[PDB]
Design an enzyme around this catalytic site. Structure first.
Site, PDB file in Angstrom:
ATOM      1  N   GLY A  68       0.736  63.528  -7.662  1.00 11.03           N
ATOM      2  CA  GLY A  68       0.138  62.222  -7.866  1.00 11.03           C
ATOM      3  C   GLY A  68      -1.363  62.316  -8.029  1.00 11.03           C
TER       4      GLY A  68
ATOM      5  N   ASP B  71       1.226  59.089   4.278  1.00  9.14           N
ATOM      6  CA  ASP B  71       2.134  60.129   3.782  1.00  9.14           C
ATOM      7  C   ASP B  71       3.253  60.444   4.771  1.00  9.14           C
ATOM      8  OD1 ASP B  71       0.658  60.266   1.453  1.00  9.14           O
ATOM      9  OD2 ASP B  71      -0.532  61.990   2.115  1.00  9.14           O
TER      10      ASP B  71
ATOM     11  N   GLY C 108      -8.943  61.438  -5.437  1.00 12.85           N
ATOM     12  CA  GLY C 108      -8.387  62.775  -5.347  1.00 12.85           C
ATOM     13  C   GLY C 108      -6.982  62.874  -5.908  1.00 12.85           C
TER      14      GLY C 108
ATOM     15  N   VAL D  91      -4.853  59.612  -7.100  1.00 12.24           N
ATOM     16  CA  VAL D  91      -5.253  58.408  -6.383  1.00 12.24           C
ATOM     17  C   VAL D  91      -6.613  57.949  -6.888  1.00 12.24           C
ATOM     18  CG1 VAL D  91      -5.539  57.338  -4.124  1.00 12.24           C
ATOM     19  CG2 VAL D  91      -3.990  59.284  -4.392  1.00 12.24           C
TER      20      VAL D  91
ATOM     21  N   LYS E 173      -2.354  54.770  -6.575  1.00 15.59           N
ATOM     22  CA  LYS E 173      -1.781  56.098  -6.760  1.00 15.59           C
ATOM     23  C   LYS E 173      -0.850  56.078  -7.965  1.00 15.59           C
ATOM     24  CE  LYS E 173       0.628  59.710  -4.179  1.00 15.59           C
ATOM     25  NZ  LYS E 173       1.339  60.003  -2.904  1.00 15.59           N
TER      26      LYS E 173
HETATM   27  O1  LIG Z   1      -7.940  55.005   2.602  1.00 18.11           O
HETATM   28  C1  LIG Z   1      -7.094  55.600   1.951  1.00 18.11           C
HETATM   29  N1  LIG Z   1      -6.120  55.038   1.146  1.00 18.11           N
HETATM   30  C2  LIG Z   1      -5.374  56.080   0.597  1.00 18.11           C
HETATM   31  C3  LIG Z   1      -4.306  56.016  -0.259  1.00 18.11           C
HETATM   32  C4  LIG Z   1      -3.777  57.233  -0.628  1.00 18.11           C
HETATM   33  N2  LIG Z   1      -2.685  57.312  -1.499  1.00 18.11           N
HETATM   34  C5  LIG Z   1      -1.840  56.212  -1.688  1.00 18.11           C
HETATM   35  C6  LIG Z   1      -0.686  56.084  -0.953  1.00 18.11           C
HETATM   36  C7  LIG Z   1       0.144  55.004  -1.143  1.00 18.11           C
HETATM   37  C8  LIG Z   1      -0.183  54.051  -2.077  1.00 18.11           C
HETATM   38  F1  LIG Z   1       0.626  52.996  -2.263  1.00 18.11           F
HETATM   39  C9  LIG Z   1      -1.332  54.165  -2.821  1.00 18.11           C
HETATM   40  C10 LIG Z   1      -2.151  55.248  -2.618  1.00 18.11           C
HETATM   41  F2  LIG Z   1      -3.276  55.369  -3.340  1.00 18.11           F
HETATM   42  C11 LIG Z   1      -4.341  58.388  -0.125  1.00 18.11           C
HETATM   43  N3  LIG Z   1      -5.381  58.474   0.710  1.00 18.11           N
HETATM   44  C12 LIG Z   1      -5.856  57.275   1.036  1.00 18.11           C
HETATM   45  N4  LIG Z   1      -6.922  56.964   1.870  1.00 18.11           N
HETATM   46  C13 LIG Z   1      -7.701  57.964   2.548  1.00 18.11           C
HETATM   47  C14 LIG Z   1      -8.950  58.309   1.819  1.00 18.11           C
HETATM   48  C15 LIG Z   1      -9.537  59.535   2.024  1.00 18.11           C
HETATM   49  C16 LIG Z   1     -10.691  59.871   1.360  1.00 18.11           C
HETATM   50  C17 LIG Z   1     -11.263  58.977   0.488  1.00 18.11           C
HETATM   51  C18 LIG Z   1     -10.679  57.751   0.281  1.00 18.11           C
HETATM   52  C19 LIG Z   1      -9.523  57.416   0.945  1.00 18.11           C
END
Ligand SMILES: O=c1[nH]c2cc(Nc3ccc(F)cc3F)cnc2n1Cc1ccccc1
Length: 331
Positions: free
Chosen positions: A29, A161, A27, A31, A46
């Site tokens: 930034g 976040d 999804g 990700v 990200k």
């Molecule tokens: O499980 C995670 N990991 C996630 C990382 C990040 N963003 C991020 C933050 C800091 C970083 F250093 C790197 C990043 F990518 C965002 N949502 C995350 N979810 C929730 C999720 C929700 C639905 C589907 C898959 C995952």
């Protein structure tokens, strides 16, 4: 230095080391889901959007990097890796952040049916355990909600976040000047009540409807809270609204654990000075099955003096580049 490779995902061009494979979009930034071949873990990568386009963008890039580099807690999203395709500071134009891929968030986990009390005990304990770590570094999340709680299929949780209006504290809704860290405790109470009952606690249609739903449950400010409001226009704005006492939560959460009702009572107090803290909530008898006072760590002191500084783009970029070069990966 490893070898990088390029591929575009959803109009976004990614430049990552060969160590990260099977890029899949999840999804300011973007990700991606990926497989870290060095560790065998599924990771979330990200890519920061336009990280050094402006002074505000560069300070936000430095803020998120300093934040993630400091958080080392099992219930808090930390940093597994930081990289950039650049080999110098003059080439430095993109920033990538790698963390755990839990798989999903707490969003819409209850839309079909509520969770058991034991399931809620395990979920809320993890949120509070990470909040005690976050608050100990003098960091307020300010905006906790189910979408900020990364969870896997075994309900292991990580706060996301750190640093919709249905989980926002009343003092933020009323635009009061002073906040303490218990504005996140109010969000946990709104989340916990939703997991127990299967329904949103305060599903306000707009902003005033959100506040009116809140004051129907927690009541209008008593004499002790009124004496702490300095603005006289703010004082009469609550006497503008209709007066009604605080409900008995036992008459609201029917059939729930009396220890769960008692905890929500301490979390959903209107006066944020009397609101329970994260460390105090961990000691509540509701978490007797999981509470371990020797396994609830706090964070190192976190320097946020950069937040009050006005620097140029090249200075924020150089400061961010220094934090990338000095990154030491976790065990
Ligand atoms: O499980 C995670 N990991 C996630 C990382 C990040 N963003 C991020 C933050 C800091 C970083 F250093 C790197 C990043 F990518 C965002 N949502 C995350 N979810 C929730 C999720 C929700 C639905 C589907 C898959 C995952």
């Amino acid at each position: 230095r490893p070898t990088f490779y390029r591929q575009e995902l959803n109009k976004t061009i990614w430049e990552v080391p060969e160590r990260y494979q099977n890029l899949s979009p999840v999804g300011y930034g973007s990700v991606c889901a990926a497989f870290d071949t060095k560790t065998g873990l599924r990771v979330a990568v990200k890519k920061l959007s336009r990280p050094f386009q402006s002074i505000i963008h560069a300070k936000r890039t430095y803020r998120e990097l300093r934040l993630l580099k400091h958080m080392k807690h099992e219930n808090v999203i930390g940093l597994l890796d930081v990289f950039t395709p650049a080999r110098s500071l003059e080439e430095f134009n993109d920033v990538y952040l790698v963390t755990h891929l839990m798989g999903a968030d707490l969003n819409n986990i209850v839309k079909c049916q509520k969770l058991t009390d034991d399931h809620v005990q395990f979920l809320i304990y993890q949120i509070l355990r990470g909040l005690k770590y976050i608050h100990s570094a003098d960091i307020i999340h300010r905006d906790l909600k189910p979408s900020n709680l990364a969870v896997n299929e075994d309900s292991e949780l990580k706060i996301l976040d750190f640093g919709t209006r249905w989980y926002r504290a009343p003092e933020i809704m009323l635009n009061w000047m002073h906040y303490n860290q218990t504005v996140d405790i109010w969000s946990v109470g709104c989340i916990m009540a939703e997991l127990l009952t299967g329904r949103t606690l305060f599903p306000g249609t707009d902003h005033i409807d959100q506040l009116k739903l809140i004051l129907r449950l927690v009541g209008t400010p008593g004499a002790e809270l009124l004496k702490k409001i300095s603005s006289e226009s703010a004082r009469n704005y609550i006497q503008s609204l209709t007066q009604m006492p605080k409900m008995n939560f036992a008459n609201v959460f029917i059939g729930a654990n009396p220890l769960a009702v008692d905890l929500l009572e301490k979390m959903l107090v209107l006066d944020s000075d009397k609101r329970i803290t994260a460390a105090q909530a961990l000691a509540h008898a509701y978490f007797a099955q999981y509470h371990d006072p020797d396994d609830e760590p706090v964070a190192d002191p976190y320097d946020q003096s950069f937040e009050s500084r006005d620097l140029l783009i090249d200075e924020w970029k150089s400061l961010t580049y220094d934090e990338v070069i000095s990154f030491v990966p976790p065990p």
